mmCIF file of C-alpha atoms and ligand atoms in Angstrom:
data_model
loop_
_atom_site.group_PDB
_atom_site.id
_atom_site.type_symbol
_atom_site.label_atom_id
_atom_site.label_comp_id
_atom_site.label_asym_id
_atom_site.label_seq_id
_atom_site.Cartn_x
_atom_site.Cartn_y
_atom_site.Cartn_z
ATOM 1 C CA UNK A 227 18.597 8.851 11.118
ATOM 2 C CA UNK A 228 17.213 12.876 11.098
ATOM 3 C CA UNK A 229 13.565 12.703 10.054
ATOM 4 C CA UNK A 230 13.358 15.044 6.661
ATOM 5 C CA UNK A 231 9.409 16.440 5.190
ATOM 6 C CA UNK A 232 8.078 18.644 2.373
ATOM 7 C CA UNK A 233 4.642 19.056 1.644
ATOM 8 C CA UNK A 234 3.263 20.215 -2.605
ATOM 9 C CA UNK A 235 0.458 20.666 -4.156
ATOM 10 C CA UNK A 236 -1.271 18.869 -7.193
ATOM 11 C CA UNK A 237 0.314 21.487 -10.209
ATOM 12 C CA UNK A 238 -1.941 22.094 -13.279
ATOM 13 C CA UNK A 239 -1.305 19.246 -14.892
ATOM 14 C CA UNK A 240 -1.989 16.662 -11.919
ATOM 15 C CA UNK A 241 1.710 16.511 -10.855
ATOM 16 C CA UNK A 242 4.816 17.431 -7.749
ATOM 17 C CA UNK A 243 7.877 16.678 -8.148
ATOM 18 C CA UNK A 244 9.586 16.744 -5.013
ATOM 19 C CA UNK A 245 13.228 15.590 -3.043
ATOM 20 C CA UNK A 246 13.263 14.134 0.218
ATOM 21 C CA UNK A 247 16.626 14.122 1.589
ATOM 22 C CA UNK A 248 18.163 12.368 -1.106
ATOM 23 C CA UNK A 249 14.468 10.534 -2.420
ATOM 24 C CA UNK A 250 13.216 12.224 -5.614
ATOM 25 C CA UNK A 251 9.614 11.048 -5.305
ATOM 26 C CA UNK A 252 6.496 12.750 -8.001
ATOM 27 C CA UNK A 253 3.287 12.269 -7.970
ATOM 28 C CA UNK A 254 1.100 12.322 -11.099
ATOM 29 C CA UNK A 255 -2.268 11.949 -10.662
ATOM 30 C CA UNK A 256 -5.064 13.424 -13.168
ATOM 31 C CA UNK A 257 -9.270 14.033 -12.454
ATOM 32 C CA UNK A 258 -8.739 13.629 -8.036
ATOM 33 C CA UNK A 259 -11.215 15.749 -6.245
ATOM 34 C CA UNK A 260 -11.640 17.313 -3.340
ATOM 35 C CA UNK A 261 -12.521 15.059 0.014
ATOM 36 C CA UNK A 262 -11.307 16.948 3.076
ATOM 37 C CA UNK A 263 -9.528 20.608 3.124
ATOM 38 C CA UNK A 264 -6.026 19.870 2.385
ATOM 39 C CA UNK A 265 -6.707 16.468 0.533
ATOM 40 C CA UNK A 266 -8.141 15.308 -3.082
ATOM 41 C CA UNK A 267 -8.802 11.891 -3.427
ATOM 42 C CA UNK A 268 -7.658 10.457 -6.525
ATOM 43 C CA UNK A 269 -8.608 7.422 -8.023
ATOM 44 C CA UNK A 270 -7.985 7.325 -11.824
ATOM 45 C CA UNK A 271 -4.956 5.593 -12.174
ATOM 46 C CA UNK A 272 -2.730 7.883 -9.959
ATOM 47 C CA UNK A 273 1.044 7.062 -10.524
ATOM 48 C CA UNK A 274 3.805 7.295 -7.015
ATOM 49 C CA UNK A 275 7.205 7.319 -9.034
ATOM 50 C CA UNK A 276 10.246 7.054 -6.647
ATOM 51 C CA UNK A 277 13.930 6.916 -7.496
ATOM 52 C CA UNK A 278 16.169 5.868 -4.784
ATOM 53 C CA UNK A 279 19.779 7.486 -5.404
ATOM 54 C CA UNK A 280 21.881 5.527 -8.552
ATOM 55 C CA UNK A 281 19.260 4.229 -8.968
ATOM 56 C CA UNK A 282 16.394 3.639 -11.656
ATOM 57 C CA UNK A 283 13.165 5.289 -11.278
ATOM 58 C CA UNK A 284 9.997 2.509 -10.186
ATOM 59 C CA UNK A 285 6.389 3.815 -10.909
ATOM 60 C CA UNK A 286 4.198 2.437 -8.257
ATOM 61 C CA UNK A 287 -0.225 2.539 -9.248
ATOM 62 C CA UNK A 288 -2.768 2.291 -5.949
ATOM 63 C CA UNK A 289 -6.194 1.700 -5.681
ATOM 64 C CA UNK A 290 -5.765 5.404 -4.664
ATOM 65 C CA UNK A 291 -4.168 8.069 -3.749
ATOM 66 C CA UNK A 292 -4.799 10.847 -1.277
ATOM 67 C CA UNK A 293 -2.942 13.867 -1.531
ATOM 68 C CA UNK A 294 -2.481 16.539 2.218
ATOM 69 C CA UNK A 295 -1.695 19.174 0.517
ATOM 70 C CA UNK A 296 -0.858 19.868 4.061
ATOM 71 C CA UNK A 297 1.029 16.822 5.278
ATOM 72 C CA UNK A 298 2.143 15.326 2.407
ATOM 73 C CA UNK A 299 5.517 13.470 2.207
ATOM 74 C CA UNK A 300 7.717 12.458 5.552
ATOM 75 C CA UNK A 301 10.944 10.325 5.656
ATOM 76 C CA UNK A 302 12.377 9.008 8.505
ATOM 77 C CA UNK A 303 11.457 6.278 10.943
ATOM 78 C CA UNK A 304 8.274 4.576 12.642
ATOM 79 C CA UNK A 305 8.626 5.528 15.835
ATOM 80 C CA UNK A 306 6.056 5.176 18.516
ATOM 81 C CA UNK A 307 7.669 7.648 19.877
ATOM 82 C CA UNK A 308 8.212 10.561 16.991
ATOM 83 C CA UNK A 309 5.174 9.299 14.574
ATOM 84 C CA UNK A 310 2.372 10.730 15.051
ATOM 85 C CA UNK A 311 1.838 12.164 12.296
ATOM 86 C CA UNK A 312 -0.680 10.978 9.026
ATOM 87 C CA UNK A 313 1.701 11.625 6.392
ATOM 88 C CA UNK A 314 0.009 10.825 2.336
ATOM 89 C CA UNK A 315 4.279 8.806 1.140
ATOM 90 C CA UNK A 316 5.927 7.021 3.605
ATOM 91 C CA UNK A 317 9.561 6.526 3.135
ATOM 92 C CA UNK A 318 10.815 4.845 5.599
ATOM 93 C CA UNK A 319 12.655 1.260 6.330
ATOM 94 C CA UNK A 320 10.275 -0.891 7.989
ATOM 95 C CA UNK A 321 12.309 -4.575 7.503
ATOM 96 C CA UNK A 322 15.934 -3.002 8.313
ATOM 97 C CA UNK A 323 17.157 -3.427 5.127
ATOM 98 C CA UNK A 324 19.273 -0.164 5.168
ATOM 99 C CA UNK A 325 17.026 0.207 2.272
ATOM 100 C CA UNK A 326 14.102 2.756 2.257
ATOM 101 C CA UNK A 327 10.275 1.421 1.311
ATOM 102 C CA UNK A 328 7.017 2.884 0.491
ATOM 103 C CA UNK A 329 4.037 3.099 2.165
ATOM 104 C CA UNK A 330 0.808 4.980 0.751
ATOM 105 C CA UNK A 331 -2.164 6.547 2.166
ATOM 106 C CA UNK A 332 -4.067 4.168 -0.484
ATOM 107 C CA UNK A 333 -8.166 3.922 1.669
ATOM 108 C CA UNK A 334 -9.973 4.607 4.511
ATOM 109 C CA UNK A 335 -10.786 1.553 5.588
ATOM 110 C CA UNK A 336 -8.880 2.207 9.276
ATOM 111 C CA UNK A 337 -10.616 2.090 12.470
ATOM 112 C CA UNK A 338 -13.829 3.911 12.481
ATOM 113 C CA UNK A 339 -13.137 5.664 7.903
ATOM 114 C CA UNK A 340 -9.221 6.209 8.956
ATOM 115 C CA UNK A 341 -6.586 6.123 6.344
ATOM 116 C CA UNK A 342 -5.537 2.932 5.689
ATOM 117 C CA UNK A 343 -2.076 2.090 3.405
ATOM 118 C CA UNK A 344 -0.281 -0.063 0.854
ATOM 119 C CA UNK A 345 3.118 -0.416 1.903
ATOM 120 C CA UNK A 346 5.656 -1.676 -0.336
ATOM 121 C CA UNK A 347 9.061 -3.595 0.378
ATOM 122 C CA UNK A 348 11.909 -2.922 -1.756
ATOM 123 C CA UNK A 349 13.058 -6.024 -2.155
ATOM 124 C CA UNK A 350 16.195 -6.400 -2.984
ATOM 125 C CA UNK A 351 16.244 -9.791 -5.609
ATOM 126 C CA UNK A 352 14.196 -7.212 -8.298
ATOM 127 C CA UNK A 353 15.410 -4.320 -7.681
ATOM 128 C CA UNK A 354 11.871 -2.493 -7.138
ATOM 129 C CA UNK A 355 9.351 -1.694 -4.672
ATOM 130 C CA UNK A 356 6.614 -4.986 -3.752
ATOM 131 C CA UNK A 357 2.992 -4.237 -2.793
ATOM 132 C CA UNK A 358 2.200 -5.552 0.487
ATOM 133 C CA UNK A 359 0.128 -8.022 1.468
ATOM 134 C CA UNK A 360 0.420 -8.475 4.613
ATOM 135 C CA UNK A 361 1.727 -5.498 5.906
ATOM 136 C CA UNK A 362 -0.557 -3.365 3.786
ATOM 137 C CA UNK A 363 -3.602 -6.059 6.212
ATOM 138 C CA UNK A 364 -2.318 -4.339 9.338
ATOM 139 C CA UNK A 365 -3.452 -0.542 8.268
ATOM 140 C CA UNK A 366 -7.390 -1.572 8.112
ATOM 141 C CA UNK A 367 -9.519 -1.283 11.019
ATOM 142 C CA UNK A 368 -6.166 0.209 12.379
ATOM 143 C CA UNK A 369 -6.290 3.349 13.995
ATOM 144 C CA UNK A 370 -3.378 4.713 12.108
ATOM 145 C CA UNK A 371 -0.168 3.582 10.627
ATOM 146 C CA UNK A 372 1.259 0.370 12.851
ATOM 147 C CA UNK A 373 5.288 1.617 14.183
ATOM 148 C CA UNK A 374 8.456 -0.431 13.754
ATOM 149 C CA UNK A 375 10.240 -1.152 16.750
ATOM 150 C CA UNK A 376 13.260 -3.450 15.484
ATOM 151 C CA UNK A 377 11.879 -6.684 14.180
ATOM 152 C CA UNK A 378 8.257 -5.496 15.479
ATOM 153 C CA UNK A 379 5.803 -3.677 14.720
ATOM 154 C CA UNK A 380 2.897 -2.717 16.862
ATOM 155 C CA UNK A 381 -0.356 -1.572 15.924
ATOM 156 C CA UNK A 382 -3.423 -1.040 18.181
ATOM 157 C CA UNK A 383 -7.280 -1.183 17.040
ATOM 158 C CA UNK A 384 -11.056 -1.385 19.571
ATOM 159 C CA UNK A 385 -14.517 0.450 20.051
ATOM 160 C CA UNK A 386 -13.181 3.424 20.840
ATOM 161 C CA UNK A 387 -13.644 4.264 23.640
ATOM 162 C CA UNK A 388 -13.108 1.399 26.562
ATOM 163 C CA UNK A 389 -11.937 -1.747 24.050
ATOM 164 C CA UNK A 390 -8.775 -1.850 23.285
ATOM 165 C CA UNK A 391 -6.582 -3.656 21.441
ATOM 166 C CA UNK A 392 -2.918 -3.500 20.936
ATOM 167 C CA UNK A 393 -1.457 -6.083 17.847
ATOM 168 C CA UNK A 394 2.434 -6.561 18.146
ATOM 169 C CA UNK A 395 3.552 -8.804 14.978
ATOM 170 C CA UNK A 396 7.033 -9.605 14.481
ATOM 171 C CA UNK A 397 8.768 -9.245 11.037
ATOM 172 C CA UNK A 398 11.121 -12.164 9.103
ATOM 173 C CA UNK A 399 11.623 -11.874 5.381
ATOM 174 C CA UNK A 400 8.330 -9.580 3.951
ATOM 175 C CA UNK A 401 6.279 -11.657 5.925
ATOM 176 C CA UNK A 402 3.821 -10.082 8.657
ATOM 177 C CA UNK A 403 3.366 -12.752 11.512
ATOM 178 C CA UNK A 404 0.727 -11.429 14.802
ATOM 179 C CA UNK A 405 2.976 -12.506 17.627
ATOM 180 C CA UNK A 406 0.749 -11.377 20.603
ATOM 181 C CA UNK A 407 -2.557 -9.498 20.789
ATOM 182 C CA UNK A 408 -3.502 -7.176 23.821
ATOM 183 C CA UNK A 409 -7.012 -7.229 24.884
ATOM 184 C CA UNK A 410 -7.991 -4.109 27.678
ATOM 185 C CA UNK A 411 -11.910 -4.436 28.571
ATOM 186 C CA UNK A 412 -12.712 -1.041 30.328
ATOM 187 C CA UNK A 413 -16.609 -0.564 29.953
ATOM 188 C CA UNK A 414 -16.549 -1.527 34.184
ATOM 189 C CA UNK A 415 -13.748 0.901 35.515
ATOM 190 C CA UNK A 416 -13.927 -1.052 39.084
ATOM 191 C CA UNK A 417 -13.800 -3.853 37.177
ATOM 192 C CA UNK A 418 -10.847 -4.065 34.685
ATOM 193 C CA UNK A 419 -10.218 -7.589 31.870
ATOM 194 C CA UNK A 420 -6.980 -7.633 29.709
ATOM 195 C CA UNK A 421 -6.649 -10.320 27.329
ATOM 196 C CA UNK A 422 -3.374 -12.043 26.302
ATOM 197 C CA UNK A 423 -3.454 -14.036 23.076
ATOM 198 C CA UNK A 424 0.218 -14.798 21.871
ATOM 199 C CA UNK A 425 1.331 -17.972 18.506
ATOM 200 C CA UNK A 426 1.764 -21.161 20.276
ATOM 201 C CA UNK A 427 2.607 -24.387 17.735
ATOM 202 C CA UNK A 428 1.345 -21.759 15.146
ATOM 203 C CA UNK A 429 -2.133 -21.184 16.565
ATOM 204 C CA UNK A 430 -2.732 -17.873 18.613
ATOM 205 C CA UNK A 431 -3.415 -19.272 22.504
ATOM 206 C CA UNK A 432 -5.126 -16.898 25.335
ATOM 207 C CA UNK A 433 -2.676 -16.789 27.911
ATOM 208 C CA UNK A 434 -2.772 -16.289 31.769
ATOM 209 C CA UNK A 435 0.566 -15.457 31.714
HETATM 210 CA CA1 LIG B 118 13.896 -1.780 3.098
#
């Protein structure tokens, strides 16, 4: 399960074409504008086409695409240990069924205007990649893309100072559900406050333990 990466920039036809760990990925995007060094914002019908081995190409049409020519593609797991990078297009099995899914840097609705993502799970029945609202939504106001551990997904939020929120989601059948929210408040370093909420009887409840 070794992680592999690659970088690329949109050529004169607004095109990239790469093979990352045996999965071919192409990008077709015109009329992009430079957002910051090495990074183009493409929001005029950008297309990300993914061809898994032995399969028909699948075209994704994200609402926008941030193409970082210095960190373009990543193929590997979302380890809390391993992945502290930000990539434009990520191939990774989020739901543990043995087939890679796709994560695309599509917005900047993360915490303090950081990256937010569109998540697409491979749907084995349909032979396609299906946009996942619940998973994409985790990245909104998050400090970055979530990490995956078994069927558990972790994400952090907060005010970038003294309030930190640590979320744990359980993923069952294309559906991410929040099961735990840990809020730590260190505004008074001498009096740190910790709040634990957990999913109980179908609702998030504050708990002592
Ligand atoms: Ca999968």
